[PDB]
Amino acid sequence: SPLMGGFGMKHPPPQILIKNTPVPADPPTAFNKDKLNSFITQYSTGQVSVEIEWELQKENSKRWNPEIQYTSNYYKSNNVEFAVNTEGVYSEPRPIGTRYLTRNL
Amino acid sequence: SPLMGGFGMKHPPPQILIKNTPVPADPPTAFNKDKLNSFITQYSTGQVSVEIEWELQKENSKRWNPEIQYTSNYYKSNNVEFAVNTEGVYSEPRPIGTRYLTRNL
Secondary structure: OOOOOOOOOOOOOOOOOOOOOOOEOOOOOOOOOOOOOOEOOOOOOOOOOOOOOOOOOOOOOOOOOOOOOOOOOOOOOOOOOOOEOOOOOEOOOOOOOOOOOOOOO | OOOOOOOOOOOOOOOOOOOOOOOEOOOOOOOOOOOOOOEOOOOOOOOOOOOOOOOOOOOOOOOOOOOOOOOOOOOOOOOOOOOEOOOOOEOOOOOOOOOOOOOOO
């Protein structure tokens, strides 16, 4: 299991490598055997979509007590947590972990 | 809808009425037309079970923000909330309502 947390896999999701194909600017009219360092400056843009299916383990506790849950707070604030501000920059308030429910040992 | 909250029904669950059948102590040997007020003192005991099936409406929010949830608190206390104390008497800490999730208007 990775020490920073997560799922350790022998064969994780493969790396996806992407490159703009070099387009030479224009060769000299007489032949030259050197490797054509002059190129047309360009960049690419696009859309990428990732779809992951996750299997869940539903909590099945017989505990009578109400449990601890992650919640937002109902107190007036300048900004909404996990939103954008007046500038338009999105920010995340605190690091949310996954351990809120309980189980017996 | 009932003003104290709940589901108003024309035909709610019917009342279940229960009574110990009176057992007369012992009648006089000569006949008397009066209605036999002398009885054997007795009480009944038993087990009662109630089974209710509830239909649920699953929350289907597209809200990015984490929501407010009912939770117990992780702070050291003399007793566990919604448990028994050293005496053995069960108590309920506060009145829990049903409105914690959110919807658009």
